[PDB]
Design a protein around this ligand. Structure first.
Ligand SMILES: *C/C=C1/C(=C/c2[nH]c(/C=C3[NH+]=C(/C=C4\NC(=O)C(C=C)=C4C)C(C)=C\3CCC(=O)O)c(CCC(=O)O)c2C)NC(=O)[C@H]1C
Ligand SMILES: *C/C=C1/C(=C/c2[nH]c(/C=C3[NH+]=C(/C=C4\NC(=O)C(C=C)=C4C)C(C)=C\3CCC(=O)O)c(CCC(=O)O)c2C)NC(=O)[C@H]1C
Lengths: 315, 313
């Protein structure tokens, strides 16, 4: 039965059990994963409102100094570019990316998107023809099976992940592993099927709009935003569009129990519906840098197109 | 059918026999790169472009005996695996060579039956592609998508004019969006008859998605031999981007005052929906890595055109 979200934990909401799966408000956890930092800022003035508690250690500045400046002063070269790329009223799915040379922290990748009147800024550390070669190989795959196999093998070669599966949704939202590339010694998940509650309904809706999410370390504690609520609204900060957003504790326990240290997945979206997932596992924690993740994002789109094409060749 | 090419004493092309020019077998290439053909098994260099000596820095005869194994040691096994016998002519493999005579070359290979076609071009060596991809996806409708696409391509390439040219059901073409330098004519809204892009060129564009003319006044460079030794027949060059452009079509560019021209197929439901069409007033060799960006954009636009057309119908 579909039911509306509970309030999050920090607003006195209940703790999540196997009973109330579908009602966890996973998009507003009030916290991020510790391998990057996040700031929120007023979309018109550029006043800095919220920051992750670890921000001082990524950005090399005291909180009170950060919060006391506008983005115009903090990001003089990027602030006008942000404002042109992310105009008021734009969708929350639109992202702008730049690379910064920050004194204390080396090269940072900056990813920005806009939710209403809020700008959300994510900072992560950042670092030949493999993509072009893959694009052509995907297109020349003769059928859906060969496409799925080429796609899994390519992603594994690009990333070094221990296990890359193509996970396909059935009409009842159960899912099946239809191809996989895996490290020697791992047991096969090919042909296994998994029940619809394994990836509940509000996670699937979010995965139709925001096409990549990850858990770099399945044992890492989440880092709170400070303050936790958006001071504009005294309400929760929407983080569905932020890759740094903390992962559901229910989902992290599910991965730890499987022996997974690091998880990533890309959505494959066909005709406006979530067709499947490029799902990756690693046994140890593992951070895939932003520019490599971009390659996977591009492959997500290519695969969406090629899945349509291969399936049309099939009636 | 097709007329024989000129160099096999076929008729010269007019506006009476537009549909019959064998644009895939011109026997020559554009001079900003070099092409070798080679045997699929032996790696034996069978044809070369008369200009190969320039790019490769090799005494002419040296090449036309040697083997790819010898000539490209690191690459030759990769090719063997990447382009297995029986693969499609559409499948391409690329690498960057740090080659003694020329700082860096791009190498592009595909296979047509028993022949490997190798293309060499100068090359080199950020977020504009990722930023463009998200911009295309958030365009609210087909019109805005067209506008974003043309603007994005112009910004990435510096081309004087970028159009989105859409085919009607009878192959009548319409410029539905345009991004252009100040002080050019506007081709926005104009329609053009189907014969401007003749049937045999639309078919080839459905399979091989990017073509160009780098300089509309440059002479083609012959293949030597012109005929493939294997077959004593013309080498198919339809999947080669270095392939010489139809003089018929180069004349049409010169008459418009264009010095350089590039397009990408937008393919939807197995059919040619439209073209990303680019003009430059002067000669312009777009480097291979930037062309790759446009090739990606072509696929992304193909996806988004279907998405956007579905939310009208
Ligand atoms: C009562 C709640 C439960 C629950 C919740 C939940 N699950 C997700 C997301 C995912 N669950 C996945 C499950 C699988 N992993 C596998 O390897 C296989 C099969 C081989 C299955 C079925 C997967 C893949 C995801 C996607 C994310 C990822 O790839 O790692 C969420 C949302 C997480 C988030 O967005 O932060 C939630 C709340 N899952 C259950 O099984 C029950 C106990
Ligand atoms: C007797 C045949 C004729 C003919 C042949 C021909 N045309 C092409 C390719 C193209 N023609 C194009 C025409 C236009 N360019 C524009 O800018 C506009 C309008 C604003 C039109 C109508 C285009 C866009 C192409 C595609 C290639 C490109 O991007 O430049 C070929 C094929 C050449 C080749 O693939 O090597 C041929 C044989 N064109 C005519 O107009 C008639 C006279």
């Amino acid at each position: 039965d579909p039911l509306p979200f509970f309030p999050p934990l920090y607003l006195g909401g209940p703790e999540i059990t196997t009973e109330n799966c579908e009602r966890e408000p996973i998009h507003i956890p009030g916290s991020i994963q510790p391998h990057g930092a996040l700031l929120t800022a007023d979309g018109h003035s550029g006043e800095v409102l919220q920051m992750s508690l670890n921000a001082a250690t990524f950005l090399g500045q005291e909180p009170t100094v950060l919060r006391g400046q506008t983005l115009a002063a903090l990001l003089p070269e990027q602030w006008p570019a942000l404002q042109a790329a992310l105009p008021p009223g734009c969708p929350d799915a639109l992202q702008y990316r730049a690379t910064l040379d920050w004194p204390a922290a080396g090269h940072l990748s900056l990813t920005v998107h806009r939710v209403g009147e809020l700008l959300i800024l994510e900072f992560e550390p950042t670092e030949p023809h493999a993509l072009r070669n893959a694009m052509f190989a995907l297109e020349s795959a003769p059928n859906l099976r060969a496409l799925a196999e080429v796609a899994t093998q390519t992603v594994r070669e690009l990333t070094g992940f221990d296990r890359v599966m193509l996970y396909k949704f059935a009409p009842d939202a159960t899912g099946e592993v239809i191809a996989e590339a895996r490290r020697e010694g791992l047991h096969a998940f090919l042909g296994h099927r998994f029940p619809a509650s394994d990836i509940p309904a509000q996670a699937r809706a979010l995965y139709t709009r925001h096409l990549l999410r990850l858990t770099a370390d399945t044992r890492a504690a989440a880092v709170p935003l400070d303050p936790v609520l958006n001071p504009q609204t005294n309400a929760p900060t929407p983080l569905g569009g932020a890759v740094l957003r903390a992962t559901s504790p229910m989902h992290m326990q599910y991965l730890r129990n499987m022996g997974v240290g690091s998880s990533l997945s890309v959505s494959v979206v066909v005709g406006g519906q979530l067709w499947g997932l490029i799902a990756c596992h690693h046994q140890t924690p593992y951070v895939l840098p932003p520019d490599l993740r971009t390659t996977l994002e591009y492959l997500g789109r290519l695969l969406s197109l090629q899945v349509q094409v291969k399936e049309a060749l099939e009636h």
